[PDB]
Amino acid sequence: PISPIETVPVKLKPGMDGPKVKQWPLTEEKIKALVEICTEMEKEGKISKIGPENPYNTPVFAIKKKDLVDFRELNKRTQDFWEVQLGIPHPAGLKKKKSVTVLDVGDAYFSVPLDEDFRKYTAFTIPSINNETPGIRYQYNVLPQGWKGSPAIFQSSMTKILEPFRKQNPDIVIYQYMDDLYVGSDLEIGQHRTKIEELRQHLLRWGLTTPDKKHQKEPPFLWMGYELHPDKWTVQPIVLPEKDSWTVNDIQKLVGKLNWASQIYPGIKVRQLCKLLRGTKALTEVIPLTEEAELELAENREILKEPVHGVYYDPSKDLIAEIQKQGQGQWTYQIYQEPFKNLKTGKYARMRGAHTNDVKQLTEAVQKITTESIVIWGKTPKFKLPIQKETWETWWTEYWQATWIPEWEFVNTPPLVKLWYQLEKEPIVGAETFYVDGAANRETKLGKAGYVTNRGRQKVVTLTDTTNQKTELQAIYLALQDSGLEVNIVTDSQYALGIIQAQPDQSESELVNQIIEQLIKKEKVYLAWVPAHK
Amino acid sequence: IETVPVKLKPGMDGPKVKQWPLTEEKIKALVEICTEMEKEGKISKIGPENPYNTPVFAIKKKDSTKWRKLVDFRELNKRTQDFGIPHPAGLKKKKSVTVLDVGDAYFSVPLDEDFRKYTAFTIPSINNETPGIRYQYNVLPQGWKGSPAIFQSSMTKILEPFRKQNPDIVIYQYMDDLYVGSDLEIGQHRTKIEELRQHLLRWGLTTPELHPDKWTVQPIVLPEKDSWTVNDIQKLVGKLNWASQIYPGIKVRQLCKLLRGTKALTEVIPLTEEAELELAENREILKEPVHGVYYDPSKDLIAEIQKQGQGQWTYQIYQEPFKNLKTGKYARMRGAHTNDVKQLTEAVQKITTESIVIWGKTPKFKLPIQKETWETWWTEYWQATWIPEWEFVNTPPLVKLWYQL
Ligand SMILES: Cc1cc(C)cc(S(=O)(=O)c2cccc(N)c2C#N)c1
């Protein structure tokens, strides 16, 4: 059954012309079929025969669906539309319901009228056995299965059509995704069922047929990742294939499933599992699962045993966000309204990169979270952070970059994030003063790094295969090594200081880490910078 | 009326910029604001056959808690052909200036039918439970660059009388705003302003204090001690050495001499008479902005900002590095005592304003803040009808101690 809705004007990309590809004559069986099938929709008005005044053609195929037109070219030539998927609603962003139902609005694609003008580009051909003279030609008069515009156009159509019902019944929740129609409400079944029918007949009044309550899917609803109930969502537990031999590609997919799991079941680990990848020569090469890997792979089966259940969003309450540090650059967080009744949860791993610190990092977490919150709940969480207000104050007021943390509150959940060290703001009286300097031949990679102090001390070192920076830093490393609890170190390096300012407590550079460790050791350090080469 | 045809710069296509997730409170605000403009016929809902999009959001002013809708046409303005409004160097000197919001005026005038498509924008839904609400302008959009242009004529007329009967007053139009400056003491200024409002209110474009050239560039003062330590000198020399990029006459050898010898930082040092002269001579060169810096209209204006901490912020507008057309400091607004973004945005605003006043042109910003952080909260505190360009950087440690002066 067709429909009476204004068609959406559709045109081909700027200056291109309809598809022009050949038909792949088929078996006696693959042609007989498409002759029947097409005679069907033919009678239903969906497609109409065309003559020679249409120069286009798309490849028609015939696959026996057990237990098809190729528009690839056409699509390329068709204009672009807006967004056929802004973002998927996330479970934690939905509010509970009394009754729920999804209708398979299915083949409504073929109920929506395709722009008449455009129809001509949709021309396809049913070949001949012995390639007689003609072939049986057709074109579409309705949204085609597999065409670029189909979803988009169907999407809108559906929306206009649903605006009034939405109006009449403002306490009802209709959500359209693909060819489904999730509907929720707080009416008791009976009242619910009625409205559904109402609605149902309402669509049907436009040509869009729908399944009887008889053939209609029911809760739990499986929503990409979750098992949906009207009062609770659940983490459809996960399966890990126990097996004899492991191929690389396998481990990959394994660590894949696992990495997605860690968001819900923190504790999950794969550090010893990623190691099985080192050096892998072929995606199909089998690997000897190490004993440490055995102990990990199993400890994970235990974790993923216990399913996870959750709660939906209650507007009348506050959103609470709590964070924890699992290790260096690893943060876990969970969002809830009522303690232990989680709405959502997750974790972030931060590849150290150039030079960061925990506070800076903590800061990035908060930020990320804040953004996804806004997307889901339209508002942002109050935060419970493992950091002392004093610690934060000290750091932020003094960092060279603009930064901020929304209303938050300290939660004493060790291990707290703190500042491993702070450089003195001014020189230390009664402290050795090391004038450090380093230099290396860019070309030869040959260097010397050393120092001299106000207390007579000195040392220098020759470095083979070093560089334009390592030397400088090393200079300071030495200075730090041989100094004792209180030091004053003057250098001319910009790279050195600039960095140490940020008070990094983690770096990509192994060297840097050396210094950091050293710095943390000292009781009081003062670093000063003087122009070079004078 | 008969609409003037507008076109995109050749080769260019409409903007397809993504919408940033908006918070709850402001979604409604927009939806509310929009269902109404639709009635009034300003905008019309569009379909999917339209692939363009621009970001939108809502802000609020003082005594005006009521939400105001704002659109980011930066990309579009960039792709919109050029046209036609001149800049006077008058208000640069005025004793006072007042800014007026004259965006409304535009909604009266229609926009060419085939350009309308490009103005498509979207009202997003929380948790994407609904598709967006696509609209498109039928009238002249606010904050768009073609708008103050097309409304030029009518504007000129409308003002001419207040103009001709008060040639002692300057009137500058920069997009949705109008800058009104007079040397007349506050009494007659404010009153004359209000009078001007009415003059406009009379036609129907509704309109709801600054102090130019009070904005003098800041000096770079060098510390003074009775006694100088090795450290003191070190810091001093570094400062100058760097500063010699602006003033080539600054010299640092005499001081650099006293620093020879591996001595303690705390160690106290007496200035040789030659170092005393050198220094004194340097203090002089710094008493005035470098010579030879002249604003070039054909080149972009640039503004750098540095976080000095304690609520302090310094900046420099320049076109060529080290040849600042103006420089300054800024102390946080009473009440932003806990957040940088708040401050930083306020700052960005004041500066853009002065830029406008002075050269009737906005500066491109280099911001000491991570893009993520900026993009997440800048809207929460914005309050201008325009949006300047910006990029994000890593403040060199030096340029920072220098301006600390
Ligand atoms: C907007 C939206 C998206 C999806 C996927 C499903 C629905 S629903 O109304 O069918 C629904 C199913 C199960 C539990 C819920 N609490 C809701 C609710 N509400 C709504």
Swiss-Prot record, chain A:
Effect of P52R: Confers resistance to stavudine
Effect of L228A: Complete loss of RT dimerization
Result after altering Q145M: Confers multi-NRTI resistance
Outcome reported for the amino acid change (mutating I129L): Confers resistance to delavirdine, efavirenz and nevirapine
Mutagenesis / variant outcome for changing K97E: Confers resistance to atevirdine
Region feature RT 'primer grip', mapped onto this chain: 221-229
Effect of M178I: Confers resistance to lamivudine and emtricitabine
Domain (RNase H type-1): residue spans on this chain: 428-534
Binding site for Mg(2+) 2: D437, E472, D492
Places the protein is found: Virion
Stretches assigned to the Reverse transcriptase domain: 44-228
Annotated phenotype, changing M178T: Confers resistance to abacavir, didanosine, emtricitabine, lamivudine and zalcitabine
Outcome when changing M178V: Confers resistance to lamivudine
Mutation effect (Y182C): Confers resistance to nevirapine
Residue numbers marked as site, Cleavage: F434, Y435
Motif (Tryptophan repeat motif): 392-408
Domain of life: Viruses
Result for mutant: I129T: Confers resistance to delavirdine, efavirenz and nevirapine
Record-annotated site: Essential for RT p66/p51 heterodimerization: W395, W408
Note: Error-prone enzyme that lacks a proof-reading function. High mutations rate is a direct consequence of this characteristic. RT also displays frequent template switching leading to high recombination rate. Recombination mostly occurs between homologous regions of the two copackaged RNA genomes. If these two RNA molecules derive from different viral strains, reverse transcription will give rise to highly recombinated proviral DNAs.
Complex and partners: Heterodimer of p66 RT and p51 RT (RT p66/p51). Heterodimerization of RT is essential for DNA polymerase activity. The overall folding of the subdomains is similar in p66 RT and p51 RT but the spatial arrangements of the subdomains are dramatically different.
Domain comment as written in the entry: RT is structured in five subdomains: finger, palm, thumb, connection and RNase H. Within the palm subdomain, the 'primer grip' region is thought to be involved in the positioning of the primer terminus for accommodating the incoming nucleotide. The RNase H domain stabilizes the association of RT with primer-template.
The protein's name: Reverse transcriptase/ribonuclease H
Organism: Human immunodeficiency virus type 1 group M subtype B (isolate HXB2) (HIV-1)
Organism classification: Viruses, Riboviria, Pararnavirae, Artverviricota, Revtraviricetes
Gene designation: gag-pol
Full protein segment contained here: 588 to 1127 of 1435
